[PDB]
């Protein structure tokens, strides 16, 4: 065996994951933030750390200003991304980047300057021998185990749907929506003010994200759920803040995820995720719709709410003709699916011809990634 | 069994063993030896000795104190010399070494290994 | 000398109390996991019969 | 790269993903423990507040008496 | 005619104003302070009085503990607010409360319970025929006389900006910041200790508030103002305490209002008021930004400092693209503008169908205010 | 008096230690019960899936 397996790096807006090719699991999973101290520090002899990256930034949220380098799938600031990649390579994996190829993922519809700068940074600074760029939903379909279906990926930055039939992707039916978990977090921060709880700064935003992850679910019938919540207090949960205070949310629990299906709550005019999937299906041809109906795959951390699969199945069945069969397939491991199939893509013997070599980059500049990738 | 943690830990133990064997190999030149990589790097003296042996260049005096901030000083002097030798380190702090973060101390040892030889 | 004895006894006692507290909270997590798994068991079995 | 690069860094021998048949029926960490401490729905827009009611069209609300004095 | 003027009551954090609908100016203006004695009473024979309300508390503040029932726009002590409203109705206006309707204002984002309590006390304890709760920024836009614009209102307890285009408000762009005149008074106390003057008790809080009202201004350029104040003693003023001592305010005249633009002085992470207005404008749609730039409206007493409009215009002009007009509209009578809006709101012919009747309250409880009020 | 403190703190330490021990034993037996429950869940899952 050649081994020398390529590093698989999944860089999204929410969390960064990294591991070795051919493994069932990523080795390192950590939030993608960069923090800097904001208070004047007076302790001489105390060690000075300029910035905090990763989990130890999350452990010291009190005296830091947390910044996200990736917003809606676009790398806004590049020095923070360089720091994140350096910490991923040298501290979390303990590998030398010169000895391995790497495989990165991105959203379908992104500015090409993002991809060009990513390739240029990965070659010039880290001296990788080869690197590849892929689309996350294709790797999700790899990890699902079928060659035909429609992938509805929803990360923390962007939610996109692609159809693939027999290994052929239709780019004119690819749909991208800028509704994701960060908008839900901001909406939760807004609607938590009604009960008197106030959260403003970034550490409180992380606490609100924890509240959203712990206590949220999607209602099957929204109006009847609202009537039930208003009638009695049978749906109420209590969360404990890091300072010992106990808050009660109650009615809000199913109101935060409902903004996924009704974007009019946030002021957007766009349709929900179910209508986006339906329109992406009907943008395809006639005969392939029956197969795409039976292979709808969910992915991403945003699709981890309880009861989302039944709601999506009901909405699609309401939208679709009655005689067809709707089957929403949702793995219990969708949260890592974008990583998993990527490892499979690095395990293939054919894929060794798909790497962008150092010689090709030197010969053709940083624009070779448009011809080589997708 | 939280398979992420299992894979990370089984890589972790073997890398710690190999790193401490290499560290003992260089630290046997002087009459010094470490038995645990985690506890012995807290004081900051062993790092200074290893850095002096590998670089062949002298370092400022460690402070002969048993306080917490004396340990912070002794670690920070070694990290300051590493910053003087063009070694690039993100989020690498003295308190991270003192309280004993596993990933950060392993990354530090790996960085010295890749920088010097 | 006995005053010197006092403080180390108290410090050891405090550490023991901390270990006891973290053990208790882990215990309540385990019990809640158990009964949640129980009704999940029941509903899945009901679907199988249907 | 003493003892070789590949021996210093414990790069895995084998591909564990190749052993399993269906990645769909996989869970890494076993379960989730939480301890307390027809027709489709039409889209709805937010209500207005600049007019009293739309209960009956072609109605002159300026002819109507004020609400509070109706006793 | 059987048309009775409805009372307009503006209840803010600092002062309470009250008058009749259709009037040009409020009849009564008095501070919202409830005081209680803190010493021994030995002159037997004098009358005993448990609580002092309004200007009576301010005249005898030397022997009282002054408490504000409303802090940060949220009322906490309900009995003190009852005393304030009752003194407004019976001693400052001398009207029967059960004859006239009333109109009340509040901050945009607040705990949901307040409105309900504000209904329940008003219908039951005072037996008014009808009432309505409005939002202060909308009434400020009424008083400005224009249908479209962006309103920034900062009182003694809260700051909020809303955009309104052609009468349609955008609720997802409404911004609330918890920075106001109370924190500026506290910061003035904290920086006055440098010169050697000590102010601790609540009477000293009133004295420091008076000092801030008389001898403060906003510098157009902060660094040049600091350099000029360090260069010579031309920028110095003197104040006389009620004891007869003389203090020299010196450098601290413009450092207190500068905290409105750089909230890092108070330890807050949030941005300044100018960036708040700019972010509220950029959160709106593309086609309405040009009209929102030309119609910026200032409001509230906290915006009363000299040199505030020039600094606001310069900062927003620096932030905005260099093509469009930046016009800051600040009426001279801005402190009362909210109340003036109320006088226009209760005089419209169509508003008589907007009152919340007692019959509807009896039918649907105190929760009717969420359905019938914005 | 200071001997009297020594006596009371010794009582407290001994009781706290053995309470910690019984908490640990309860933890262990609950954990292995959870393991039995999870195989039961998995096998009825697989039957329903087929
Ligand atoms: N258990 C959970 N339940 C509900 N939502 C979750 C859960 N875990 C994570 N999330 C949401 O998913 C987001 C993480 O998405 P992720 O898949 O990591 O994005 P990406 O990997 O594309 O960067 C978080 O912002 C969080 O809001
Ligand atoms: N002429 C002035 N110059 C500077 N500051 C003022 C002036 N008048 C009032 N203020 C400040 O404004 C505050 C009063 O705000 P106000 O407009 O009464 O809010 P609200 O009406 O919501 O109670 C006072 O605390 C005072 O500090």
UniProtKB/Swiss-Prot annotation, chains A, E:
SUPFAM superfamilies: Actin-like ATPase domain. It catalyses: ATP + H2O = ADP + phosphate + H(+). The modification Methionine (R)-sulfoxide is found at residues 43, 46. ISGylated. Oxidation of Met-43 and Met-46 by MICALs (MICAL1, MICAL2 or MICAL3) to form methionine sulfoxide promotes actin filament depolymerization. MICAL1 and MICAL2 produce the (R)-S-oxide form. The (R)-S-oxide form is reverted by MSRB1 and MSRB2, which promote actin repolymerization. Its EC number is 3.6.4.-. The modification N6-methyllysine is found at residue 83. Signal peptide: none annotated. The modification Tele-methylhistidine is found at residue 72. Actin is a highly conserved protein that polymerizes to produce filaments that form cross-linked networks in the cytoplasm of cells. Actin exists in both monomeric (G-actin) and polymeric (F-actin) forms, both forms playing key functions, such as cell motility and contraction. In addition to their role in the cytoplasmic cytoskeleton, G- and F-actin also localize in the nucleus, and regulate gene transcription and motility and repair of damaged DNA. This is Actin, cytoplasmic 1. It comes from Sus scrofa (Pig).
């Amino acid at each position: 065996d050649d081994d020398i397996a390529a590093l698989v790096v999944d860089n999204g807006s929410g969390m960064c994951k990294a591991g070795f090719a051919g493994d069932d699991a990523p080795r390192a999973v950590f939030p993608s933030i960069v923090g800097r101290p904001r208070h004047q520090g007076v302790m001489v002899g105390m060690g000075q750390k300029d910035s905090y990256v990763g989990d130890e930034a999350q452990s010291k949220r009190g005296i830091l200003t947390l910044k996200y380098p990736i917003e809606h799938g676009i790398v806004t600031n590049w020095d923070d991304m360089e720091k994140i990649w350096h910490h991923t390579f040298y501290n979390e994996l303990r590998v030398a980047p010169e000895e391995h190829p790497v495989l990165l993922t991105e959203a379908p519809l992104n500015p090409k300057a993002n991809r060009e700068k990513m390739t240029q940074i990965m070659f010039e600074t880290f001296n990788t021998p080869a690197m590849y760029v892929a689309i996350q939903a294709v790797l999700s379909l790899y990890a699902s185990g079928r060659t035909t279906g429609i992938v509805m990926d929803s990360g923390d930055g962007v939610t996109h749907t692609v159809p693939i039939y027999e290994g052929y992707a239709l780019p004119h039916a690819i749909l991208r929506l800028d509704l994701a978990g960060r908008d839900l977090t901001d909406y939760l921060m807004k609607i938590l003010t009604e009960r008197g709880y106030s959260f403003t700064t970034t550490a409180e935003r992380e606490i609100v994200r924890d509240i959203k992850e712990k206590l949220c679910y999607v209602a099957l019938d929204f109006e009847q759920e609202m009537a039930t919540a208003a009638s009695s207090s049978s749906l109420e949960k209590s969360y404990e803040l890091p300072d010992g205070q106990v808050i009660t949310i109650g009615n809000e629990r199913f109101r935060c995820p409902e903004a996924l299906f009704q974007p009019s709550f946030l002021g957007m005019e766009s349709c929900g995720i179910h209508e986006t999937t339906f329109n992406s299906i009907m943008k395809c041809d006639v005969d392939i719709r029956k197969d795409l109906y039976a292979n709808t795959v969910l992915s991403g951390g945003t699709t981890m709410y309880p009861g989302i699969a039944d709601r999506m199945q009901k909405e699609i069945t309401a939208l679709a003709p009655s005689t067809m069969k709707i089957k929403i397939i949702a793995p219990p491991e969708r949260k890592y699916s974008v990583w998993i199939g990527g490892s499979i893509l690095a395990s293939l013997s054919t894929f060794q011809q798909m790497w962008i070599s150092k010689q090709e980059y030197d010969e053709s500049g940083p624009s070779i990634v448009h011809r080589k990738c997708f | 069994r939280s398979r992420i943690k299992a894979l990370a830990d089984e890589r972790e133990v073997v890398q710690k063993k190999t790193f401490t064997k290499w560290v003992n190999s260089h630290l046997a030149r002087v009459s010094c030896r470490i038995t645990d990589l985690y506890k012995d790097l807290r004081d900051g003296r062993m790092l200074i000795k290893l850095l002096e042996v590998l670089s062949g260049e002298m370092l400022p005096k460690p402070t002969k104190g048993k306080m917490r901030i004396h340990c912070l000083e002794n670690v920070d002097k070694a990290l300051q010399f590493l910053k003087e030798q063009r070694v690039h380190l993100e989020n690498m702090g003295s308190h991270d070494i003192v309280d004993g973060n596993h990933r950060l101390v392993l990354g530090l040892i790996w960085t010295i290994i890749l920088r010097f030889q | 000398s006995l005053n010197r004895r006092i403080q180390l006894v108290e410090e050891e006692l405090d550490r023991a109390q901390e270990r006891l507290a973290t053990a208790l909270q882990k215990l309540e997590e385990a019990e809640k996991a158990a009964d949640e798994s129980e009704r999940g068991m029941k509903v899945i079995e009901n679907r199988a019969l249907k | 790269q003493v003892l070789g690069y590949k021996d210093l860094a414990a790069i895995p021998k084998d591909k564990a993903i190749l052993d399993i048949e269906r990645p769909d029926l996989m869970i890494y960490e076993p379960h989730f423990t939480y301890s307390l401490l027809t027709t489709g729905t039409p889209r709805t827009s937010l209500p207005h507040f600049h007019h009293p009611e739309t209960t009956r069209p072609d109605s002159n609300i300026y002819k109507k008496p004020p609400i509070y004095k109706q006793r």
